Amino acid sequence: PGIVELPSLEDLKVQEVKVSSSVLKAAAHHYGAQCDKPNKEFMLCRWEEKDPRRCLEEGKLVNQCALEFFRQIKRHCAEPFTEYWTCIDYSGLQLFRRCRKEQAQFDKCVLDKL
Amino acid sequence: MSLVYMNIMMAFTVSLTGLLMYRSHLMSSLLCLEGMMLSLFILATLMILNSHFTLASMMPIILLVFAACEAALGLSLLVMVSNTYGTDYVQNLNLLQC
């Protein structure tokens, strides 16, 4: 009967955050702090309409917010953020109690400097 | 239609004909009843898994435990018949004629 109304390939081109998983998992909480304020727009769109192919502008918005956040954490302290997530990477499933002292180090970096 | 359901229904008919036609021992009949039980278990479990019928997913294990204690009662009845007779054939039961 009725045909679907798919979006085009012009909206299906956002600069995708092609980052890996352990760095994204370790960089979650402060990403919840600074960013993730305008993506509850996306969450409320997803739970008031059960229809992606519609809420994709806010998906592009959370994509650019996460990329902007990782740009901002890339430019400033820390570069031992790399040491922190590679300390937490090879520990099986990533328990956050594993590398706790360097978690304190990254917190002290980002707190005293940003 | 999730094609495997056809094979498990045909397997149910296999176990049901094995339950109905049975030559000598009652134990084969009771074990094919158990096979029919397993068929219903597997068929309903694949249905509930693919449905994501996650609230009432109790059907496989509870169907299992009930018809298992049915099979326990059948074992006790077969032991009683084999105790008051020599064997447990379908024959040597032709007394009490209808």
Binding site: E16, K18, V19, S20, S21, S22, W85 | -
Partner: protein, 70 residues
Amino acid sequence: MWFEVLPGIAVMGVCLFIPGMATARIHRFSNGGREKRVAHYSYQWYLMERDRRVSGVNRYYVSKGLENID
């Protein structure tokens, strides 16, 4: 004395010492110094799938950190 039984128990304990240590060495070798990612939940498996998708090598151990941001 029991100095003459400790070689037997010693060699049998070495026979029990070997397989987990060699297995953990093969775990660390088959992912380039990484640990093999355990998988118990759909969340961890989907995170692993997007990790092996974004890596480019279709391999989840390369772990591609901070050098594809801009």
